[PDB]
Design a protein around this ligand. Structure first.
Ligand SMILES: O=[N+]([O-])c1ccc(O[C@@H]2O[C@@H](CO)[C@@H](O)[C@@H](O)[C@@H]2O)cc1
Ligand SMILES: [Ca+2]
Ligand SMILES: [Cl-]
Ligand code: NA
Ligand code: NA
Ligand code: NA
Ligand code: NI
Ligand code: NI
Length: 565
């Protein structure tokens, strides 16, 4: 299917080298910062456990399988396909969904076009198990596309069909309707690929065959041509080694179609592909450092499930907003998930969560939308959570925990908690700065004049007397001068890698000399930072025998910036 439409004149070919030579992560994704994920489908009718109800109900002995036999009947009489007539979606309204999405301040929406269960939520000739001919009997993706255009947001979608090749594997080991191979809804019924976590290693089982890869291409191209989304989200098994040649065929056609659309698109994968040819995404987790290329965090308002389920513990607005600012400060964007009820009603708790984020963004949005990272992302005591599947832990921040964003040379310092006293922005200490002059200090949403004092330890900022908002509190700082970040170290063979960021806040160009002395080995570099800009600087020290026992010193224009005496 991919090798049929591709021409020798197309810009993108089905390999990573061809993508890197012509694709660039678009500016709208860097500026959007906030998006809304929506898990909603046939799995919402039982609303038990999670959206993995379709897989576990066919594994004999699993709690969901024993739950399904007593609640709905034996697997040979009531399979997953029998939930579809109950999926009427009597209270679904695309405008109501977008009104809630727009209320949250989000800039794009990502509904689920098809999950692992093999049920398409759109007008599909390829898949007879679609939402137009059965269930809701309407084009859910098409109606959400028109509602998104009327709301002024950008339309994306997510595809999970890659896992459909093995999601119903347990239906073959127990008498069920999955053993009826005439039902294409249940996929290829192969074994799940091995390798725990986000790894391309698959081992004994491929997780896909040559037929499911053919269907994946026709499935993705049906979403590309019918709805022309500006972003497509994929789940984890697309990154497996046997599936990568097939996925590169999609990326070449998707990007080539975007050139004809006069639009710029984004592809989301959780592993297996370079940070520069697509937007890396972490499930229920964020990064601890600033990443060079834009990335995304996808997480659910509910702690247990993505789709709706009885007894879901939803996250607090402060939990999400504290993590949202942390994600944005590291060049990441948040894809927050909501799980509507089976009839299409978004719960009151998840509407209040999105509303509080929008109310907080209405006041502090200037430090989020269109912003970029500063020289350093965070400062303070608590570093917060980071990594795959660590979002549920809420970090208890104080006012001394500060996140940084920059936009149009302005500096934004976000305190993740409130205080009636003062904090000191240690990142502006005299050892990091050269001729830094503070021009104005401002808290977004407050009419009070902020008292500040520049010291050698940093910029002391006194909080106002009345909170503009809760959750997080933003200081807008206008300044000139050159600021360096505290260096971070990584391990290499017989040496170490030193990474710093330099921000020139002056209106004219500046020459900067950086020196790193590790274990006596001295390496220097001179860099010219243009006016009102930032730059990464990477240096390498040699002849370093013990990384864990290093003696490191970093100098910014012959001034000691960092040392671990
Ligand atoms: O490797 N894993 O065991 C694994 C991998 C992914 C996973 O969640 C995957 O993505 C979520 C959204 O980020 C949901 O769509 C979920 O239904 C899906 O299985 C759940 C478990
Ligand atoms: Ca907070
Ligand atoms: Cl940039
Ligand atoms: Na749109
Ligand atoms: Na197999
Ligand atoms: Na004070
Ligand atoms: Ni919480
Ligand atoms: Ni507060």
């Amino acid at each position: 299917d991919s090798t049929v439409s591709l021409k020798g004149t197309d810009v993108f070919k089905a390999d990573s080298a061809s993508i890197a030579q012509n694709y660039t992560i678009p500016e709208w994704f860097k500026d959007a910062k906030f998006g809304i994920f929506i898990h909603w489908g046939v799995y919402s009718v039982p609303a038990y456990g999670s959206e993995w109800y379709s897989r576990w109900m066919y594994k004999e002995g699993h709690p969901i399988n024993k739950y399904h036999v007593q609640t709905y009947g034996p697997l040979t009489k009531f399979g997953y396909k029998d939930f579809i007539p109950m999926f009427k979606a009597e209270n679904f309204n695309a405008d109501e969904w977008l009104a809630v999405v727009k209320s949250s301040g989000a800039q794009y929406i990502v509904p689920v076009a098809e999950h692992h269960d093999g049920f398409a939520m759109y007008s599909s000739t390829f898949n007879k198990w679609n939402a137009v001919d059965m269930g809701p009997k309407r084009d859910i993706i098409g109606e959400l596309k028109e509602a998104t255009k009327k709301a002024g947001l950008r339309f994306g979608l997510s595809s999970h069909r890659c896992e459909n090749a093995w999601f119903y594997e347990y239906g073959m080991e127990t008498p069920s309707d999955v053993q009826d191979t005439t039902i294409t809804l249940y996929g290829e019924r192969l074994h799940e690929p091995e390798g725990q976590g986000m790894t391309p290693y698959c081992g004994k089982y491929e997780g896909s065959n040559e037929r499911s890869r053919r269907q994946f291409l026709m499935h993705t191209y049906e979403l590309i041509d019918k709805y022309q989304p500006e972003l497509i989200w994929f789940n984890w098994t697309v990154g497996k080694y046997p599936f990568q040649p097939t996925f590169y065929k999609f990326m070449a056609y998707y990007y080539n179609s975007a050139l004809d659309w006069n639009k710029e698109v984004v592809v989301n994968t959780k592993f297996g592909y370079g940070d520069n040819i697509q937007v890396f995404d972490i499930e229920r987790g964020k990064s601890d450092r600033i990443r060079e290329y834009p990335w995304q965090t996808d997480t659910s308002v509910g702690k247990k499930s993505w789709s709706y389920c009885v007894g879901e513990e939803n996250k607090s607005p402060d939990h999400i907003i504290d993590d949202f600012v942390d994600i944005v400060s590291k060049n990441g964007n948040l894809l927050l998930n909501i799980g509507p009820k089976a009839d299409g009603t978004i719960t009151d708790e998840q509407k209040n969560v999105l509303a509080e984020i929008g109310k907080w963004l209405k006041t502090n949005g200037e430090a989020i939308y269109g912003s970029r990272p500063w020289v350093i992302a965070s400062e303070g005591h608590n570093a917060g959570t980071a990594g795959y599947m660590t979002d549920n832990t809420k970090t208890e921040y104080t006012a001394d925990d500060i996140r940084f964003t920059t936009c149009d040379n302005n500096l934004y310092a976000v305190s993740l908690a409130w205080t009636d006293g003062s904090v000191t922005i240690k990142s502006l200490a005299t050892k990091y700065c050269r001729n830094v002059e503070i021009e104005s200090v401002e808290m977004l949403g407050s009419s009070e004049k902020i008292d500040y004092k520049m010291t050698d330890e940093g910029l002391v900022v006194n909080f106002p007397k009345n909170k503009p908002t809760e959750y997080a509190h933003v200081f807008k700082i206008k300044l000139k001068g050159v600021v360096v970040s505290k260096p971070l170290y990584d391990k290499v063979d017989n040496g170490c890698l030193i990474t710093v960021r330099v921000a020139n806040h002056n209106a004219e160009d500046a020459n900067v000399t950086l020196k790193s002395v590790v274990d006596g080995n001295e390496v220097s570099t001179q860099v010219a930072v243009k006016a009102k800009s930032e730059q990464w600087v990477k240096m390498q020290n040699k002849d370093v025998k013990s990384f864990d026992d290093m003696s490191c010193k970093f100098y910014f224009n012959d001034n000691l910036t960092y040392e671990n005496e």
